[PDB]
Design a protein around this ligand. Structure first.
Ligand SMILES: Nc1ncnc2c1ncn2[C@@H]1O[C@H](CO)[C@H]1CO
Ligand SMILES: Nc1ncnc2c1ncn2[C@@H]1O[C@H](CO)[C@H]1CO
Ligand SMILES: [Mg+2]
Ligand SMILES: [Mg+2]
Lengths: 191, 191
C-alpha cells in the first residue's frame, strides 16, 4: 500500500505557487490547520444550530480533504476556479480518487473509499469553510510578517469570508472568537 | 482566545533539535502524520481485537497530543526521558495544560479540557504508538535522502518498534502493511 508514503509525500506539495512567502507552506501543515479549524467550527455549529455532527467522519474528511494533491499537486484557486479549468479539474480529481488505495485491507480500503467519496454535504461544507478560514489565516500571518504582496490576497479572502458570515452564523461566531486579532502580536501563553 | 494562534504557532516548534536533517520538521507536520497513523492503527486494532474505539476522541487527542510544546518547545526524547528530567517535565507539561485555554466558550472550553486531560488509557496508548511509528518513519525518510546521521537513530527506533510488535498485534500488522518498504523508492501513484 502507498497510503503511508502518500501521508508523508504531502509535505512535498507546496501551496501558494506564484506568490512570494516568508514561510513556505505544504499540504500537511495546511491539512493539520484545517482539521483543527473544522473541529472548532463543528462545535460552534452544533451549539448554534441545535444538532450533533458525526465528528469522526468530519475529522477524517478534513484529514484527507486534499490527499489527491499528491497526484494533482496544489493548483491555486484563481487557476482551478477558472471556467476553462473548473470542471475538468473536478473530473481529474475524481479520477485520482478512483485509483489511490490499491493494496489495502477491507477495513482500511472501504473506510478510506467512504472518506474520499463522502456524500455528507454538511461535512463537505464545514471543511470548505475551514479551508477558506485557513487561507485567510495564512494571508494574515504573511501580512503580519511584513509581506505586502499578501495584502490584496488578505483583502479578497477577508471580503469573501465576511460575506459568508452573513449567511452562516457559526462562521460569524468563529470570526468573533478568533479572527479579529490574528495573529496575536504578543504570545503571552508561552510564559 | 489564543487557541487559533497556538494551532499556527506549532509550525514554529522544530523537532529533532541537535540532529542534522535534510528536511526540517515542525510539530504541525508531525501531528498531521500522527493523526493519520493513529487512525490507521485504530482500524487495524478494531478488526484484530474485536472492538470499536471512539474515533472522535482518538483523533482529537492525536490532533492536540503535542499542543503543550507551544510552551515547552519540543524536548527530544533522549533528554526528556533522562531520569533527572522525566518526572519534572511531566509536571511541567501538566502545568501547561492547566493554563492554556482561557477565554473560550463552554462548548470549546470543556471539550478541549476533556481532550487534554484525557484518561482513556487505550487512546493514549494508540497515540504513543503512532508517535513512535512517526519518529521511525522520519528516520527512514532521512536515511533514504542519504542522511548517515540518522542510521543509528533509525536502528534504535526500529529495534524498539520491533519489540513492540511482539506485544501489540495491531502494530505488527501495520509494520507488515506499510513499514517494510518505506519510503517508496518509486512513487507510482503519482502517474
Ligand atoms: N488571491 C489569491 N492569489 C493566489 N493564490 C490564492 C489566492 N487565494 C487563495 N489562493 C490559494 O489557492 C489555494 C486555496 O485557497 C490557496 C493556497 O494555494
Ligand atoms: N535517537 C534519537 N536521537 C535524537 N533525537 C531523537 C531520537 N529518537 C527520537 N528523537 C526525537 O525525540 C522526539 C520524539 O521521538 C524525536 C523528534 O524530536
Ligand atoms: Mg484544503
Ligand atoms: Mg508527538
Amino acid at each position: 500500500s502507498s497510503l503511508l508514503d502518500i501521508i508523508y509525500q504531502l509535505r512535498q506539495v507546496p501551496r501558494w505557487d506564484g506568490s512570494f512567502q516568508f514561510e513556505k507552506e505544504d499540504v500537511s501543515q495546511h491539512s493539520f490547520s484545517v482539521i483543527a479549524i473544522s473541529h472548532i467550527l463543528c462545535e460552534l455549529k452544533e451549539t448554534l444550530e441545535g444538532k450533533k455532527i458525526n465528528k469522526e467522519k468530519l475529522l477524517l474528511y478534513a484529514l484527507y480533504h486534499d490527499v489527491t494533491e499528491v497526484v494533482s499537486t496544489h493548483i491555486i484557486s484563481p487557476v482551478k476556479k477558472n471556467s476553462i479549468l473548473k470542471d475538468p479539474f473536478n473530473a481529474f480529481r475524481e479520477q485520482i480518487k478512483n485509483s489511490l488505495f490499491d493494496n489495502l485491507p477491507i477495513t482500511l480500503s472501504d473506510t478510506l473509499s467512504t472518506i474520499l467519496n463522502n456524500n455528507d454535504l454538511e461535512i463537505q461544507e464545514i471543511v470548505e469553510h475551514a479551508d477558506h478560514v485557513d487561507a485567510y489565516c495564512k494571508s494574515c500571518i504573511e501580512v503580519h510578517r511584513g509581506n505586502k504582496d499578501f495584502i490584496s490576497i488578505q483583502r479578497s479572502l477577508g471580503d469573501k469570508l465576511d460575506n459568508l458570515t452573513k449567511e452562516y452564523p457559526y462562521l460569524k461566531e468563529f470570526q468573533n472568537l478568533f479572527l479579529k486579532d490574528f495573529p496575536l502580536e504578543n504570545k503571552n501563553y508561552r510564559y
